[model samples]
Target: MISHIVAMDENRVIGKDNRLPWHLPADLAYFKRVTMGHAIVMGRKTFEAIGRPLPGRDNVVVTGNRSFRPEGCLVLHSLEEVKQWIASRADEVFIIGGAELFRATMPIVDRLYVTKIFASFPGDTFYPPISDDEWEIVSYTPGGKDEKNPYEHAFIIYERK
Candidate 1:
């Protein structure tokens, strides 16, 4: 299945200046837990922001340009290539973001794993609105405080209907 994963603010703010706008350790851990064994597809900028491929998952970076391939990342020029790769993988595929990547694959996405933070920040990137007619909330979990991190968030699983 195609799943879109992201952490967003109440106002749906996703990122600013090519980086996450907030630091929530719980959210990070939650992200790792969900995506650990799956394949993740993301844009070139998103890959650059993270600096390296995330361990324990197959990392696929989507870019329009043929140049700039990072070690350990499978670079593809089109969504069709990504679809072919996902078709061959047995595990679920997660479309992690940067706006363009998300937008391109939104229609084909089967579900969304979203962590909604209760605040907003100045951001240059934004998630596309979840169309009420096409998607429905299937599950939600209010995040609890972690001794290591002091931010509040909630998880929502949206299935395309």
Candidate 2:
């Protein structure tokens, strides 16, 4: 299964300057908890934004540049190679991203793991708007809602129609 995992504001803003604009510890923990021990495929920029490989998971980077490579990562020249990269990893794969990767894989992914951030943020990168015709919510869970995370947030799961 291919799944898209993201945290976005109401405006669909996912990031600004390559990294998330807000901080939510619960969201971070949620991401780690769900994606740990899974195969995570992301764009080169997203990999750079993280600056290091996440522990306890297989990190695959899809980049067009043949010369671009990060330490402790499995670099695939294209998303087309994703099938090859995931040969025996897991039945479910996590597609973590910068905007480009999210937009690219959204149409084909089986599931979506989204953190709906209930606040507006300054962002240059945005998640592609999900249409009701294509996706339906499967589950929802409230996340952190106090001080550090001023606005309420929720973890929502979506399955393709």
Candidate 3:
């Protein structure tokens, strides 16, 4: 039951210059809540962008190069290797990404947790297009603009069918 989690803009943009283009406190809190106590797998670049392991979750950083190890992260070279590491606990695994990693594991994922922002942003990193024919929307919650944040957004749970 592998899950993919991401926050994307209207244009499907996920990041710019290796950082999130938008700041949504509610979305961040939601991410933390849902992924807490889960095993999170991400590419080395994604882990570098995050700076440190996200508290309360098992951080497994995937990298082809073994020389670039970061402290406190379980580093692996391939998705198959990750699968072996979490064999029995696969249902509790989550793929947190930066494009390439997501594309690699998309076909095997069972669930998607997406925060959809209602605005397009200039970005270098983007989330892969989700086909309506393949993913079923299980839930959606629209958000409104607040004093701190000027954009409208929504949270969606999608299950591959």
Candidate 4:
């Protein structure tokens, strides 16, 4: 299966300066739980932003440069390369973000794991719009409320129609 996993604010802002615009530990935990043990495909810039290979999953980075290889990551050249790689594997695959990567793979992803933040944020990067005509939520769970995770958020799973 192929999935897109992301957290976005009400304004569709996903990041600023290559980092998340807000802090939400609960959302992070949800991300980890869903993506752990799966192969996560990301763009080179997203990989760089993350700084290092995230433990407990296979890191697949896509870039135009064949020479751009990072330690512990399998570098693929394009969206087609990513799809071919996923097609060859039986395990689940996740498309983790940066705007371009998300947009490229949005058309073909089978599911979307989204952390919906109820507030807006200022950011440079944004996630592509999720069309209600194409997707329907299969599950929804409200996030916790506390000093650590003050935002009003919900973890939602959407399957393509």
lDDT against the true structure, each candidate = 0.87, 0.86, 0.87, 0.89
Q: What is the TM-score of each candidate against the true structure?
A: 0.93, 0.92, 0.93, 0.95
lDDT of 4 by residue, 36-57 (tens): 9889989988998889989999
Worst 10 residues of 3 by lDDT: 83-92
Stretches of model 3 off by over 4 angstroms after superposition: none
Model 1 has an lDDT value of 0.87
- Ten contiguous residues with the weakest lDDT in model 1: 144-153
Better of 2 and 4 by TM-score: 4
Lowest lDDT 10-residue stretch of candidate 2: 82-91
**How many steric overlaps are in each model, in order?**
0, 0, 0, 0
Q: What TM-score, to 2 decimals, does candidate 1 have? A: 0.93
- Point out where model 4 deviates above 4 Å: none
lDDT of 3 by residue, 1-161 (tens): 88899999988998999988778888888889988988899998899888999989989888989797888888987667867875666456889897988998898788899989999889998899999999999999997779766799999999976
lDDT of 2: 0.86
Candidate 1 lDDT by residue in tens digits, 35-141:
99788999988998999999999898989788878999889887688778767766688999988888988987899999988776788888989989999999999
Tell me the RMSD of model 2 versus the true structure.
1.6
lDDT of 3 at 111: 89
> Across residues 1-161, which tens digit of lDDT does each residue of candidate 2 receive?
78999999989999887777898988888999999988898898888888899999988898888888788788888556766665555568999997888888776688999999888999898889888998999999998698877789999999977
The prediction achieving the highest TM-score against the true structure is 4
CA RMSD of each candidate after superposition: 1.5, 1.6, 1.4, 1.1
